[PDB]
């Protein structure tokens, strides 16, 4: 609550708020160092694992309940990056950073 | 003398108005989507029955 | 609880350009975080692992 | 309206704040400066304009 300026953040530059400018704890680019789910808005972000970026949704998937072999045969790989099927909202993102 | 940023005018290709610049309409799809609305908004819903049925409802 | 197995640890480098209020100082700037994925904030020496 | 409250938020266009909300984001010593906007509205201690 102290990190943002709650009496002042009402207005937009981009779709990010004023609070994502007055303090780097509230924007969607400063990633917390131990993430469990990927965030919701990655407009000005591109995440890399190999030499190339991982922008399109062709290298993201999640199935628990079907117990498939090509995930569990490439657990220590660099391509697939089996994300959770639950994106993180603004509150869980900034509180993870906190 | 490096890569600085100044106030250029915002260039945007536009069109000044004329007398024969027409906005063409898709006939065979959008007029045929307007057809069913035109034939269904003739019969009924004249907005002359709601307050008159209310002032008849208070009577009866 | 072995219903929800995740993959191994893989360090995610994030190439995230800055916002559009500090962009004009070197507009070819990018940042580089090193956020880890599938891990834990370990604080002790795990004596069995 | 008791059912149309979720039908109001189904558009995604922001509502601008009014002048009374524009008058509370100032400290007590910055109200009397030219950077303030609403000095052409604060005309009476009994009435809002």
């Amino acid at each position: 609550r102290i990190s943002a300026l709650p009496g002042l953040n009402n207005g937009q530059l981009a779709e990010e708020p004023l609070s994502a400018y007055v303090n780097a704890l509230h924007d969607h680019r400063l990633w917390p160092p131990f993430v469990t789910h990927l965030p919701r808005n990655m407009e000005g972000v591109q995440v890399v694992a190999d030499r190339q970026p991982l922008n399109p949704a062709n290298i993201e998937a999640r199935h628990h309940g079907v117990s498939d072999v090509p995930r569990l045969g490439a657990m220590d790989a660099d391509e697939p990056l089996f994300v959770d099927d639950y994106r993180a909202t603004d509150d869980e993102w900034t509180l993870q950073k906190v | 003398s490096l890569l600085h940023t100044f106030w250029r005018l915002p260039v945007a290709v536009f069109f000044e108005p004329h007398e024969e610049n027409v906005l063409r309409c898709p006939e065979r799809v959008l007029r045929r989507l307007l057809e069913d609305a035109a034939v269904t908004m003739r019969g009924g819903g004249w907005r002359e029955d709601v307050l008159m049925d209310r002032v008849r409802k208070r009577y009866l | 609880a072995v219903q929800f197995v995740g993959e191994h640890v893989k360090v995610l480098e994030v190439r995230a350009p800055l916002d559009h209020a500090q962009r004009q100082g070197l507009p070819d700037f990018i940042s580089r975080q090193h956020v880890l994925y599938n891990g834990c904030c370990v604080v002790t020496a795990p004596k069995t692992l | 309206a008791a059912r149309r409250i979720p039908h109001f938020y189904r558009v995604r266009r922001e509502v601008p704040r009014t002048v009374n909300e524009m008058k509370q984001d100032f400290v007590v010593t910055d109200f009397y400066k030219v950077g303030n906007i609403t000095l052409y509205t604060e005309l009476h201690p009994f009435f809002d304009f």
């Binding site: 890399v48 694992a49 190999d50 030499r51 790989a77 660099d78 391509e79 | 003398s1 490096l2 890569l3 600085h4 940023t5 | 893989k10 360090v11 995610l12 480098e13 500090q22 004009q24 100082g25 070197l26 | 910055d30 400066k33 950077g35």
Partner: peptide, 29 residues
């Protein structure tokens, strides 16, 4: 400080290009 708003947020304070001129891998593994 709010008098100096006509000074602090001009773009010439945030341009290090003449300052820069005068001053002078696979993550999978």
């Amino acid at each position: 400080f709010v008098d100096a708003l006509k000074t602090l947020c001009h773009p010439v304070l945030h341009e290090p290009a003449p300052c820069l001129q005068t001053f002078t891998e696979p993550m999978g593994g």
